[PDB]
Amino acid sequence: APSRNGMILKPHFHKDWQRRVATWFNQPARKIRRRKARQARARRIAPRPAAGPIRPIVRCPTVRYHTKVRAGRGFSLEELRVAGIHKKVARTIGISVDPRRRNKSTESLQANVQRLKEYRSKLVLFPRKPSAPKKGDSSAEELKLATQLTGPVMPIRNVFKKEKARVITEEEKNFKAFASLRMARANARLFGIRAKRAKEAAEQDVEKKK
Amino acid sequence: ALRYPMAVGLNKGHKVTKNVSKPRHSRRRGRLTKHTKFVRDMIREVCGFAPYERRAMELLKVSKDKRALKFIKKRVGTHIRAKRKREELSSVLAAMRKAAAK
Amino acid sequence: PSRLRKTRKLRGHVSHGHGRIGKHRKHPGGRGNAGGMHHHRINFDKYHPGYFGKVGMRHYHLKRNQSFCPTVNLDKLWTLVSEQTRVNAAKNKTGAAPIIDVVRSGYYKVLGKGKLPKQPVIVKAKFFSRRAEEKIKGVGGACVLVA
RNA sequence: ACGGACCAAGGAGUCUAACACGUGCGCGAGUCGGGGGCUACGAAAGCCGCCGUGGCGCAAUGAAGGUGAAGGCCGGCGGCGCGCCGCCGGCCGAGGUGGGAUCCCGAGGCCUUCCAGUCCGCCGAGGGCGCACCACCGGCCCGUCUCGCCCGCCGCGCCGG
RNA sequence: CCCCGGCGCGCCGGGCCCGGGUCUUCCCGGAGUCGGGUUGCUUGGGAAUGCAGCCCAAAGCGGGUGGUAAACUCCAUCUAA
RNA sequence: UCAGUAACGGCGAGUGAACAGGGAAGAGCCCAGCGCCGAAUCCCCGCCCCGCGGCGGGGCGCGGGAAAUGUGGCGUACGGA
Ligand SMILES: [Mg+2]
Ligand SMILES: [Mg+2]
Ligand SMILES: [Mg+2]
Ligand SMILES: [Mg+2]
Ligand SMILES: [Mg+2]
Ligand SMILES: [Mg+2]
Ligand SMILES: [Mg+2]
Ligand SMILES: [Mg+2]
Ligand SMILES: [Mg+2]
Ligand SMILES: [Mg+2]
Ligand SMILES: [Mg+2]
Ligand SMILES: [Mg+2]
Ligand SMILES: [Mg+2]
Ligand SMILES: [Mg+2]
Ligand SMILES: [Mg+2]
Ligand SMILES: [Mg+2]
Ligand SMILES: [Mg+2]
Ligand SMILES: [Mg+2]
Ligand SMILES: [Mg+2]
Ligand SMILES: [Mg+2]
Ligand SMILES: [Mg+2]
Ligand SMILES: [Mg+2]
Ligand SMILES: [Mg+2]
Ligand SMILES: [Mg+2]
């Protein structure tokens, strides 16, 4: 029996909800447990970063988000082939690799190849045997100075380029933005209809000539 | 007249150049290999044809293409698979006609 | 605070604030939204109009990401860019108009609602309004489209 | 008419979610770390801002494709029959009427021996800017209906305004 | 003061004779399965989301998906049994 | 968080996700097929050495079986030989 004025409402409590009530009193204990597991992993891998391997500069799908840049699953095989790193060497030297990704854009391809070139320079590779170093190993001065990096290694920042104040030209003054938008809407709506009418008019012209 | 990159229209989207890379190797599944064609025509020679396929061959011999398409569509389901089976039966009917002629 | 609630003052009173003639029974008029067409017709007519029935097309798999188009007005267009840009645009004698990137600020469409100060702009947005274009061209400025 | 021998103890509008209204506090076109991470009581507390992602609010409307919230005046030119429409340069540039708490101006006077006579207050005829709010008249955006005239081209059209 | 496990060092017995780039020549896929009709249950899934019973029953530049059933046409994206 | 939203429902009562974004965590792979290698493979029993309270490693057996109706190595959609 509703009273004078109020919102219509649909409470979803018609099931037996009191059996399945997830209480959240485990929350600070789980924060302590995640903290101890993370410190245990950081003490387990002693020179390696506590976060993990590096993750790609990634454009977002689904037009709400495509201006933003994320950290992705892993590097692409074409990215590794251009940078010159084998995909099984990359997992051993601490590089996220996934074979599912493609490379349609050239700019993001070059950006991830450049990020590989920066990470190969920033990487300090320790030798397998300390008594007998190999050809592709770091120097003894870098062996002592190498340490962990707290947080995400090379944190991806959404950079925006800075433009300067320009003088407005007569073509920019004479450009019609809303009219161009409406003409583009009309052409994208009527692209197939004009082509069908052109084919039908060509058929009428062939029927008139022949 | 300048043409700004528009989010809507016939050529919408942000202007990004496209590279020409090697296509994926998972895309070529179902490609007709010569050895698989040999195995396939081999077993077509050994086992023979199905009864509904023989009935559709008879419907193509009596020149009823629409009724043959309706029968193959009722037997196999979709119209695309029906048209492919009708073209395959017409091809093997032309092959049998050429073998009977010369 | 149970000492501030109403159950403290009603101790001693028999019907407990729920009436002596008509008792506080469990569900006298049904549960929830019971009888909105039959015996609660007047309440839903006077307070929830249009509640019953269907209208419009059934868009099956709707996408709020596709429906995403945030708007910003020309009245608070200068809140997106810092104030020293406005100072330098008012100070420059040559006429170097500042570029306001609306997609960088986080809006797609620019609508023209309020007064714009008399200095040229270069508004780079995804969509534009006709009134917004008229205000920008009347003040001075350009409307650059971007995808 | 029903319940009731008597006495002691227990005993009945609680809790969660959602919504509405009122009040208190903080910030304010912003607000919020609730999820995550870092540093006995302490499972607390403090911190994060390139962890404000995200919710709500700042823009509504249409079933949807979509669209999306003041104008006036001067000069020049083109068209049509001093008047109207369209295109460029400067100015005024955010509606009005009535009721409106408060504020502003001050015709005059506020007494000790008569006149002249400066400053601080104080009250007020009458006239104003008018807070909020109310009632109305206007104006703008959106869907729909009617009457007609013009503008634009990367694609002259069953185009767009 | 005992017991246990782990990080390392030194020795013995073994397995193993192991990579990358360029060019040429070959090869490459899971069948009463997919899918279609019908029925029953289920799902927010609505001309049938998923599963199951019966009947039909595949193909290889093929097949599945692209939230309205269908035909034509280009695309996008995966490789089921 | 999307979101009590799209959607389902005598469209009534009521029911009701998914994508994406921010995080905790993050790890990838192996066969059949297709093919190359004298079955190059596996199990059990006899003897010797070590160790034997998770019955394991090596050598010696014209010892017994499994397996060509296919065991092992290279190799699996990220191509492979
Ligand atoms: Mg009541
Ligand atoms: Mg993490
Ligand atoms: Mg009383
Ligand atoms: Mg009572
Ligand atoms: Mg009461
Ligand atoms: Mg009475
Ligand atoms: Mg009552
Ligand atoms: Mg009640
Ligand atoms: Mg009735
Ligand atoms: Mg009696
Ligand atoms: Mg009684
Ligand atoms: Mg009695
Ligand atoms: Mg008592
Ligand atoms: Mg109420
Ligand atoms: Mg309140
Ligand atoms: Mg059942
Ligand atoms: Mg059901
Ligand atoms: Mg299609
Ligand atoms: Mg919400
Ligand atoms: Mg009804
Ligand atoms: Mg249910
Ligand atoms: Mg997600
Ligand atoms: Mg084999
Ligand atoms: Mg796979």
Residue entry with tokens 């043959």: B68
Could you tell me the distance, in angstroms and rounded to a whole number, from the CA of residue A37 to the centre of ligand 10? Answer: 78
Tell me which residue of B13, B28, B18 sits closest to A102, measured CA to CA: B18
Among B4, B10, B19, the residue with its CB nearest the CB of A188 is B10
The residues in A 138-197 lying below 8 A from C, measured between CB atoms, are 160, 163-168, 172-173, 175-178, 180-181
CA distance C132 to A178: 9
Letter for the amino acid at A54? I
Tokens of C51: 């509640």
CA distance A49 to A75: 18
CA distance A203 to A197: 10
Sort residue A23 into left (φ over 0), alpha (ψ -120 to 50) or beta: beta
Tokens of C44: 């839903």
CA distance C77 to C71: 11
Strand order in the sheet with C127-128: C71-73, C109-111, C127-128
On chain B, the residues whose CB falls within 8 A of the CB of C146 are: 4-5, 7
Is the CB of B19 less than 8 angstroms away from the CB of A106?
A: yes
Give the containing element (helix H, strand E) for C100.
strand C99-101
Helix, coil or strand: residue C120: coil
CA distance B52 to B57: 8
Q: Does A60 touch chain C (CB under 8 A)?
A: no
User: What is the DSSP code string of B9-74?
Assistant: STT-S----B---PPPTTTTTT---HHHHHHHHHHHHHT---HHHHHHHHHHHTT-HHHHHHHHHH
CA distance C98 to A90: 46
Helix, coil or strand: residue A108: helix
Is the CB of B4 less than 8 angstroms away from the CB of C144?
A: yes
- Those residues with Cβ within 8 angstroms of residue B86's Cβ, 6 or more apart along the chain or in another chain: B56, B60, B65, B68, B69, B72
Count of C-beta atoms within a 10 Å radius of residue C14: 7
CA distance B5 to C101: 15
- Those residues with Cβ within 8 angstroms of residue C2's Cβ, 6 or more apart along the chain or in another chain: C8
Tell me the shortest Cα–Cα distance from B21 to chain C, in angstroms.
26
